[model samples]
Target: KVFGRCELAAAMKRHGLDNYRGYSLGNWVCAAKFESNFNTQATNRNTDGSTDYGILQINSRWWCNDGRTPGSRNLCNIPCSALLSSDITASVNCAKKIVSDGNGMNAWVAWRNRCKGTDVQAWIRGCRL
Candidate 1:
C-alpha cells in the first residue's frame, strides 16, 4: 500500500531522518515521492534488466536481492522482498546507508532530476508529523 504524506513524515521522523546525512526530511520525502509515490511495493525494471525495489527504489544491481540480478553488491544485505512492505523499518535503514555511501540524496536519480535544487518544502508542507 502507498503511504500518505503525513504518514511518511511520521515514519521518517521515527526513523530519525530529520537531518540524516546532511539531507533534510523534506528532501527525503521528495525523493520518495518521485521514486515510488510512497508505494512500498513499487518495482521498476531498469533498461539494464536490473530492477529497482521498494519505496526508495533501491537497485538490484547494488543493494538488494532481486533473484535475477546476480553479483549484486547487496550492500544492504536485504532481500528485495523486505523492501516491498508497508513496514519500512528495513527499507529506511538501508536508505540511510545508501545515502551515506553515495552523495547524499543524489543517489536517487528521481531526486536529482526532480527534487534537487527545488523547494522541497512543498513536499512536506501542511503535513503534521
Candidate 2:
C-alpha cells in the first residue's frame, strides 16, 4: 500500500514533515481508511440515494462542471456522486492533495477533529481557510 512511501517521503522532506513525524505519508493511509476504507474504487450513497464517487468519495455532480475538478467520471464516474472512472491513480492523486493540505494528520484528523475532536466542519469550515 505504501508503494510510493519512499517518493512521498522525499517530497515531504521539502515540507519539513520528516518521515519520523506523525505528519508522514503514512497518515494518508489512515485518512483513506477512515474516508473510504482504502477502496480506490469506493463509492457511497448520498442523502438522496445518489452517489459519492471515486476513492476520496468526491461528488462529481458537485465538481464536474467546475474547472478545478479533476478528471471525467467514465473512469469511475457515478451519476450524482464522484466521477466513476476506474482510474485509481486519479483518486489516489486527488486524495494526496487533501492529505498534503493539512500539513499532516490529514483527512482523518479533519474528520476526527471536526466530528470528535475540533470543529464539526473540518476543511469545509474555518479549517479550509
Candidate 3:
C-alpha cells in the first residue's frame, strides 16, 4: 500500500528504530534525494562493474549473508508490482545495513558528528542500547 506521508512517518518512528540508530527520516530524505532522487524503486548496472537497486540502493545479489552466492535481486529491479508489498521499516533497515555492515555512513558517529545539528532537546530521553 502507498501510505500517506504521516503514516509513513509513523512507521519510520516505530520498527525501524534500533540501538544507536540516529538517521531520522529527515536525513534519509536527504540521502534519498541524492541517491535515486527519492525513487522507491530504482536500479543501476554500472559499467564500472557494479549494480545498485531499490530505494536504499540494495544490491542483494552483490552483498548477501555470504561472500559467495549472489543474493536476492532487488524487488524493484524485478516486476514493478512487487514493490506494493515493500514496507517502511524494510527501506530504513536496508539503508542502515549499508551504513553499518557496509561500513559507509556510520549513523552512531553521524549522530554524534551532527549532534549540534540534531533537533533533540535535553528534556528528551534517548533509550540506551
The number of the candidate with the highest TM-score is: 1
- C-alpha-based local distance difference test score of model 3: 0.44
In candidate 2, residue 109 scores what lDDT? 43
Q: What is each predicted model's overall lDDT from 0 to 1? A: 0.88, 0.41, 0.44
Per-prediction TM-score to the true structure, in the order listed: 0.95, 0.40, 0.48
Which is superior by lDDT, 1 or 2?
Answer: 1
Model 3 lDDT tens row, 1-129: 434333444455575543225555545433444445445666565454445544445554533221222444443233322322356455565555556654444323333354325453321233221
Residue-wise C-alpha lDDT for candidate 2, range 1-129, written one tens digit per residue = 222323433333434433333343344433444555545456665555335555346544332222324553332332322334543445544444444555534334433543334332222222211
The predictions' CA RMSDs to the true structure, in order, are 1.0, 10.6, 7.9
Backbone clash pairs for candidate 3 read none
Could you tell me which 10 consecutive residues in candidate 1 have the lowest summed lDDT? 64-73
Superior candidate under TM-score, 1 versus 2: 1
In model 1, which runs have C-alpha deviations exceeding 4 angstroms? none
Q: After TM-score superposition, what is the CA distance of residue 12 in candidate 2 from its true location, in Å?
A: 12
Measured by TM-score, how close is model 2 to the native structure?
A: 0.40
Worst 10 residues of 2 by lDDT: 120-129
